[PDB]
Write a protein that binds this ligand. Structure first.
Ligand code: A1EMX
Ligand code: A1EMX
Ligand code: A1EMX
Ligand code: A1EMX
Ligand code: A1EMX
Ligand code: A1EMX
Ligand code: CL
Ligand code: CL
Ligand code: CL
Lengths: 274, 284, 284, 274, 284, 274
């Protein structure tokens, strides 16, 4: 039966929903409009709430909980998302629940990922658009880092467009509360030395941005991959970009964490206000 | 500098080849192979089609993206070699020539295989000759009978991890999740694929039978040209041994009939590779 | 028309006998056997004492009531053949001569056995010679040692599924629930008998030891001429290794003593057939 | 501890019952008078409620729940029984509960099964008695079928006499709600073709009745078994029966489901009113 | 009077020795051995250093405090003999010469071993030569490879149950909790030690890998001269594969590196003895 | 999350304790002052309640519940301790709870065990001290036996000094309610014959006392061990003891349970009042 899942400690009710009928709460409480993703995790659906008639995205897990490591891992993501709270540059969880060991996360409906969007574009992607996504994501970072949180998976796949283009940060499954693994492609190098902080996310975002700005897939290994983490920009990757944008990325990809700019620090720069 | 990675180890762990000079700054992989193409790229790193400068033969070499990111990462990467080795040579199992590390980077050199079943069957329509399927079925069953006889379970049987070999013979690959039954213990499989998972895994315990289901689904998927259910009702039905007519139709009663045996929800009633390979429709 | 059912299969699956003409409308079973008596009837169908017209020898043939009612039904029925075959020949295990199907009807032909222990001991009072028991004990232990050595577990050990053979030698039968450990995986046994079940089965996981308990109870039941508890307090006590005096009394300290070893609640401390058959009171 | 089991979504209380004492709720809340059955499932007891001093039958499961398939299967039977509701020709569940993974169903005390009763009789069983059992069971069927339910196990073992002989239908463990296996002896033939409906139960009842009317055990296989499912009455099985009764059974055993009479249709016939 | 206890049994169960006269009221143990010292005393009873009057050789004889206190007690005591026997002879496994009972008292005669690792390393400081450790590591790994090859799991691997042998060779002992995988079934280990327990045991199921973790911790403990966490945060960290710097430091990267492989939380990724003994640092 | 564990059938609250913080209830609700024991079971800590600022001892289990046999066995001890109730010669449980499958028992802080204390003494242990411990423990026994309870593990390890020396009986994990194993060293002989009662505990206490009085470790086997259970006092073990004390122990170590004195009977003797 449906149980609200929240770390702000719990039954659910809605129009369209009759506990005695066989169909699930999800099945009964929403119209399914499209499938926005699918893979290991399950499926993401475009849904209209029969409660309010508003659009949302719901994430359904594929199989029931396989055990505690599956359950714990799955439920961590809610705990995380909640700890983030409401921010206009961070994907918003309306509510979560389980029914038959299946986990559903109800969020604000976001548009495509930056990866999808920039892919659909050519390399003719306006540097304007980029700056917007940059500021927009730094704001998301600035918000998380100030709360003592590191996302650890900052990449175009995990960043979605809102209505009016404002880009928001999502997939908080790998988010950690400092004190209490991520994509090797966007991995910060301090991580290889067992050391991490908020800096990590800034590096990843540096690369998130370099990738979409250049419309060049980032190296999957070899010398290419090392160079970036020794703060070397390939001229192959720095053409068609404003001396302004390039200089910023240099400061985001500074190999020394202790020397790498902050989100707040970056959002202080003239090019990154308004 | 290049350390051989093997659990059948030897006091010959320094690596040598034609075209390789240690005093040159290039890596062994850069010096020792001609990269002819890239066959894959993802989280794991990259796979290249390469010519050996030593023996001039063609291979696949999987190179890991970053160095070892940590103890778990190192263990996970090395476990694949350990597994791949436990399998041994079988004509229906991807052969590993050798594995080595250099500055924390794991390289696996295997025989060069064609594309995965996923790719191959994607590339066919539902025009896929049911004949080819039986081939794939038999060829993978043989691989399993070989693994299962040796008390090994793969736990990642799927069209993605099944590659086409010399002529038509399809090879079972990606021994990342393979376990030796009795070593680990039948417990929760964390990093498994739920799309192909056997029902008994949801209750924690498993056996070889697990792989037979997974192959059931693997074959069903490619046989139908249908993507398998990613959750909800559809997904549970297959693990309660219901064949939703949308799939079962288009497939000879003969083929239809077998998959049933493979998809029996009860591991204890589910056919073995040994047993299935005894049926006439799957011999020679 | 008659298709042989075997998982040691062959390209000789069409069936032939003296007295069998394919062009006659009678079934192979009707044509090929003289039915001398009916030894059983229930849900499963029927068992007949029959003379082979081929070799004139006496057998038991179990014929299934209906055709295959569905995929589960077909699988369940065929799994018994598969199991019965995995057992092999042992003087203390019911021998299968052959299995076949015809219009969806499964027939199992075994050696002709006498009545089950249940029947035989029912028919005795508590006048049952304790001597006979040891025989049954030893004879069934041998059967288990044979199964367990081969990594097989029966999971349906009970006086109902134990039949008397040529002279006195009691045979273990009904391999319907038998599993190959490592194939299925130690998980919930759905269609088991709780009256003889080992405690460890309530916690999902099991081993060969399971059968030893079941035989513990099997022997206890017939040794006492007492029906075993069908639930409540009485039932839990046996699986917490308490011997309620109402049973333990009337049985030689020697016999009493052994059943204890067999009924140890902890599979990890419970005796093996191998080990028990080493004790002097159970040799030759 | 005792938990009410009901799909009409739950603690229990009674005289004789002290939560602090070791003995179970069942042990404490009833006197045990006889054992009415025993087998795979556990035991059925004749009980006097210490609450009301009224007679009931309680069904105790033998072992604790062996796992989810055991628990689910066991609990299905309650769900089923509830969905049936109160009918004078259907066995009545007072309440169900579990305590230490043991499942108890409390029903109205029924007399013996038709199988027991007709066995205890000879073949001298009045055709009168039969008609009563026939009408009585059709009523049970008529009630279930109108609610969209198929019993799937309609046989003399699963039909009990009430006080004043009125025969009631029981064992709803195999009952299914159309939309959302049975005895081969009483199995309808459409079932062999993957097709089922309410008709199934009518066929089974046709055979339930043929059996007790003839005091002949029904074929366990061979040609005997097939014939019936090709609508052939053996003259061995149709002697000593009224042309009336025989004709009815013909209509109940019509091999084509789409051609087989309904409970309502049958209860409309002159011989089957009063 | 003295009955030999063996599950490789024989029709020679009455016991005889030089210095033993049955008609004397003294026990066999009192008559047949010279007690030279007491090597242990606890709940179990007592262990003595003894000279055989038969063969004049030195042994350890463990004598049980009371007679058999009950069926569980008898079973528990006899299971150790049964296990100790299943192990067989291995130079790195404590050898049992014989076991016998007399008036309900179980005696186990083994080779005479030196002190346990616990004692030996207690008696050293952190001045313990890391060299000795590798020896102990390798020597115990060999013991496990021997057990694991034979489908046996010890489930009580710890410095207490590891004794020093002829010269330096450390021997694995106390086979009280040892189980034969497939006999019992992977289920809850009641009388286990949580201080050395592998994580997978908390989820009910296990394999040989269990012992490798336990040895991981065994070696970590003695390598550090640190007592292991008896609960709270500290205890869970080791079973989630975190090496709290307080331990990991002071140990060669080489040694540090290996323990990681042994302490991998995921049994399915955790190294085998076979595999570890292949690494150069652990050969000859 | 924290759940009160009691068989008097349950959330917990306290100062210092914030449900949202990561640290456990135990971690948050107490200061840890010393570790009083450690072994198989886990650890015993000297704690100051942040609630009341009073001293207690808490017993933490080492690993989460390993399964039902581990959980049941662990929880039995609470059930037991509760059934004992409040007595000045019996260790007092304030409360118990679990959090993350870890079990905590909160008791009155006791001083060292008799084993510890008498060990720390020589054999110069005043016979006075002994008598006090004897009476004090008989009172504990008298209380338990009158309630139909046998402790089954009566030894110097399981008996602690209170403030003002009054010795109290603890570790009720092996306590049984007559109707509804112990240390072989202090084992009563009837036990070897499958028979037990309240007498058992009296024998064990007879030996508990003999041991500390003599400052001699009790035989671990051989003839030594049998003799005591055939009511034979070794002169090695009866020197330096008052004819009074010796005679008492004879009556406590009477091999025949049916002939062995009671706690009440013993507490009736002149030497054992005040
Ligand atoms: C073409 C196209 N493709 C995909 C999308 C899309 C994916 C998506 C995922 C979430 C989400 C959910 C649902 C749960 C947790 C969580 O962190 C997130 C980010 C929300 N909105 C989304 N929109 C839109 N358009
Ligand atoms: C179009 C196309 N796409 C992909 C391929 C291809 C991928 C591939 C991977 C391995 C391999 C490696 C390299 C390491 C470990 C391991 O388990 C395996 C299976 C071997 N042969 C391969 N061929 C060919 N053609
Ligand atoms: C009074 C009396 N009652 C019953 C018998 C009897 C039943 C019986 C069943 C089989 C058999 C069959 C036929 C198939 C599969 C299978 O596992 C088995 C054990 C073999 N021999 C039998 N003898 C004899 N006498
Ligand atoms: C000689 C004799 N033998 C047996 C009986 C008898 C069996 C019986 C079973 C139920 C019952 C129960 C208890 C639970 C669920 C359920 O569907 C049912 C039908 C109710 N009343 C019964 N009476 C009477 N007389
Ligand atoms: C200082 C000191 N302390 C302890 C010893 C010591 C204890 C010991 C126990 C056994 C033994 C026995 C006797 C029975 C069963 C069994 O598994 C074992 C391992 C064998 N050898 C031993 N040596 C030596 N020196
Ligand atoms: C030197 C020294 N060492 C140890 C102690 C000491 C141990 C101890 C154990 C409990 C206790 C607990 C905590 C739980 C359940 C239970 O039955 C009991 C008896 C209470 N108080 C104690 N004090 C004092 N001084
Ligand atoms: Cl793959
Ligand atoms: Cl049977
Ligand atoms: Cl030990």
């Amino acid at each position: 039966q449906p149980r609200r899942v929240s770390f702000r400690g719990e039954t659910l009710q809605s129009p369209g929903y009759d506990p005695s009928r066989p169909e699930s709460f999800f099945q009964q409480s929403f119209q399914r409009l499209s499938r926005l993703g699918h893979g290991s995790y399950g499926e993401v659906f475009k849904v209209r709430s029969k409660e309010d008639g508003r659009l949302y995205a719901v994430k359904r897990s594929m199989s029931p909980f396989r055990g505690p490591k599956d359950r714990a891992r799955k439920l961590a993501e809610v705990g995380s998302h909640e700890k983030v709270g409401q921010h206009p540059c961070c994907v918003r969880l309306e509510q979560a629940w389980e029914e038959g060991g299946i986990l559903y996360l109800q969020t604000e409906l976001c548009g495509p990922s930056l990866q999808q969007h920039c892919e659909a574009w050519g390399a003719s992607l306006p540097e304007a658009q980029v700056w917007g996504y940059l500021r927009d994501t730094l704001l998301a970072l600035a918000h998380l880092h100030s709360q003592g949180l590191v996302h650890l998976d900052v990449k175009p796949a995990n960043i979605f467009l809102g209505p009016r283009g404002r880009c928001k940060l999502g997939d908080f499954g790998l988010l950690v509360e400092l004190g209490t693994e991520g994509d090797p492609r966007y991995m910060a190098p301090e991580l290889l030395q067992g050391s991490y902080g908020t800096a990590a996310d800034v590096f990843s975002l540096g690369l998130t941005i370099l990738e979409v700005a250049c419309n060049m897939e980032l190296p999957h290994g070899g010398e290419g991959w090392q160079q970036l983490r020794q703060g070397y920009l390939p001229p192959e990757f720095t053409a068609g970009l404003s001396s302004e944008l390039r200089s910023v990325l240099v400061m985001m990809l500074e190999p020394d964490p202790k020397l790498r700019a902050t989100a707040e620090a970056l959002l202080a720069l003239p090019v990154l206000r308004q």
